[PDB]
């Protein structure tokens, strides 16, 4: 019997962003968010607005709201997050 404990693991993080893709959903910005992907029948597919910051980054409104609920920093660039468009 060989149980395993204390896995010291090393990984390389790299910037992987797709054009016109939500950085939290990892799907298209124009589609519904991963929170609105569930219960799609009840969702009206209108509340998922594409929010843009002063850094010209596109996110889903639900994703960026849940992000700002804990971290006030944009994920793609480590900057304080604003809103400019709807």
């Amino acid at each position: 019997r060989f149980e395993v404990k204390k896995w010291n693991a090393v990984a390389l993080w790299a910037w992987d962003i797709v054009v016109d893709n939500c950085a939290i959903c990892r799907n298209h910005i124009m589609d519904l968010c991963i929170e609105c992907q569930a219960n799609q029948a009840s969702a009206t597919s209108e509340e998922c607005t594409v929010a843009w910051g002063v850094c010209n980054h596109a996110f889903h409104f639900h994703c960026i709201s849940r992000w700002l609920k804990t971290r006030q920093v944009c994920p793609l660039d480590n900057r304080e997050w604003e809103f400019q468009k709807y």
């Binding site: 019997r1 060989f2 149980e3 395993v4 404990k5 204390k6 896995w7 010291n8 693991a9 090393v10 990984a11 390389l12 993080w13 790299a14 910037w15 992987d16 962003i17 950085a23 939290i24 990892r26 992000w67 994920p75 793609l76």
Partner: protein
């Protein structure tokens, strides 16, 4: 004569009388002084050196020959003190010899030579030629020696040197490092060794590594140690990242019971010299999959927009040897961990079984099996001891050694010629890239150039990092020609034209 001119003549003619006296007593007999320069410098007569220096500074064209003689003497002394070195402690001996030569000659210049800037420049040139002791038909071994020196001081060891000893030894070492050309090789070698020290925990203290990185930044620039500081930052914030991951898994809506403790070391991909260029598809063992999926979910949540590549060869774990009555707990690599878990699946194993279970490449699997039989963790029940398609072994029941933890395989030192050749090849590729960048930039600035002028200005521009061999400039020019980014004149290859 100065006293007599002061007591007799006008104060406005003090310098003319002394100048005429020196131009008819010292400047006239210049050949005798330049002949005795060699003897005085080589046998190092302090008072005679000062007396010669004052007069040769007074004469318009007497100083430079003494400068050349001192430069040649320092070069000969450095060659005599840095080429007849041993092989057991070559980096430390090389650095200490260069420090001793530099210290004694700075003392000589500041004491019996008035600390002239020309002589300090000559000493710097002589020490630069000494440390760049290119053995014929070979490569310069100095950057590797300094990298090994840095690794030896900054690694935790049993020597007993405190933090202040590391600090002032590295502060002295910076003087040796400043004379070192081909700094790209040293940068890559120190990046590799710093990566090994940070990952494997061999660093004695993070403060010493930060201080050494800051010293190199002051000595060369922020662009020299940008990657090094990124590595240090990613290994310092890793504690906070692991704490955040633990807080995430302890605050999940559904309680998760993963039976492994983590010390995750997520690193930046663009800064560390590591790679996944080995094409081995290790996948994962069964027990690690749930928790690695949990960590990938956490990283997708708390650090969104980035994907992480798992360097399976640099990971490590602790397998409890609960088979033969718990002798100890073995510190292994995930390749060996997967092999041992495959043995835990069934007491009989095979090379085909390991191939279909761990999915590793044949070379890596053979290397791990060799390292396992070297530490006699396995018993090698098959007859042949070389590479085999049988690979039948359960376990060596005599492996009940006293130590509570064993490193059944080692990767800290290594320094195989393959990795050194790969590092030098990456150095050459970056050198070609920087050389062609310099070519395009300086011929955009000039727009009209010849061979010799372009070579000289490119050598001068590149001197902050390396001395560029003309064949490399020719190769990058040919690359730019083939990629139709440059078009030299069709009348002759000497003249050049923009685009």
């Amino acid at each position: 004569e100065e006293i007599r001119c002061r007591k007799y003549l006008h104060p406005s003619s003090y310098t003319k009388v002394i100048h005429e006296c020196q131009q008819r007593m010292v400047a006239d007999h210049l050949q005798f002084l330049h002949a005795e320069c060699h003897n005085i410098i080589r046998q190092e007569k302090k008072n005679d050196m000062a007396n010669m220096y004052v007069l040769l500074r007074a004469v318009s064209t007497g100083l430079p020959h003494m400068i050349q003689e001192l430069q040649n003497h320092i070069h000969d002394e450095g060659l005599r003190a840095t080429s007849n070195l041993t092989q057991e402690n070559m980096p430390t001996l090389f650095v200490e010899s260069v420090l001793e030569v530099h210290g004694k000659f700075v003392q000589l210049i500041n004491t019996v030579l008035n600390g002239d800037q020309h002589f300090m420049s000559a000493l710097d040139k002589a020490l630069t030629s000494v440390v760049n002791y290119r053995e014929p038909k070979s490569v310069c071994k100095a950057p590797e020696l300094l990298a090994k020196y840095c690794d030896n001081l900054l690694k935790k060891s049993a020597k007993g040197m405190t933090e202040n000893e590391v600090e002032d030894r590295l502060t002295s070492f910076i003087t040796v490092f400043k004379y070192i050309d081909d700094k790209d090789v040293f940068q890559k070698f120190y990046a590799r060794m710093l990566a090994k020290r940070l990952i494997h925990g061999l660093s004695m203290s993070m403060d010493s590594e930060e201080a050494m990185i800051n010293k190199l930044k002051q000595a060369c620039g922020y662009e020299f140690t940008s990657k090094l500081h990124r590595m240090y930052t990613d290994m310092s914030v890793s504690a906070d990242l692991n704490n955040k991951f633990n807080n995430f898994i302890k605050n999940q809506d559904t309680v998760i019971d993963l039976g492994i403790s983590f010390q995750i070391y997520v690193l930046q991909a663009g800064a560390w010299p590591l790679t996944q260029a080995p094409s081995s598809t290790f996948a994962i063992p069964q027990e690690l999959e749930k928790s690695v999926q949990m960590f990938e979910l956490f990283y997708s949540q708390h650090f969104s927009g980035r994907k992480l590549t798992w360097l399976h060869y640099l990971c490590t774990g602790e397998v409890k040897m609960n088979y033969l009555g718990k002798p100890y707990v073995a510190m292994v690599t995930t390749y060996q961990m997967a092999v041992l878990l495959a043995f835990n699946n069934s007491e009989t194993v095979s090379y085909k079984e390991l191939q279909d279970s761990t999915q590793m490449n044949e070379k890596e699997l053979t290397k791990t099996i060799k390292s396992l039989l070297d530490v006699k963790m396995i018993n090698h029940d098959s007859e042949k001891e070389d590479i085999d398609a049988e690979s039948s072994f359960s376990l060596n029941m005599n492996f009940s050694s006293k130590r509570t933890k064993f490193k059944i395989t080692t990767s800290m030192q290594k320094d195989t010629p393959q990795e050194m050749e790969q590092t030098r090849s990456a150095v050459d590729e970056d050198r070609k890239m920087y050389l062609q960048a310099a070519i395009v930039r300086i011929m955009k600035a000039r727009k009209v150039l010849r061979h010799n002028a372009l070579i000289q200005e490119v050598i001068s521009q590149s001197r902050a990092r390396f001395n560029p061999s003309i064949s490399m400039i020719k190769k990058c020019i040919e690359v730019l020609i083939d990629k139709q980014y440059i078009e030299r004149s069709q009348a002759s290859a000497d003249e050049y034209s923009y685009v």
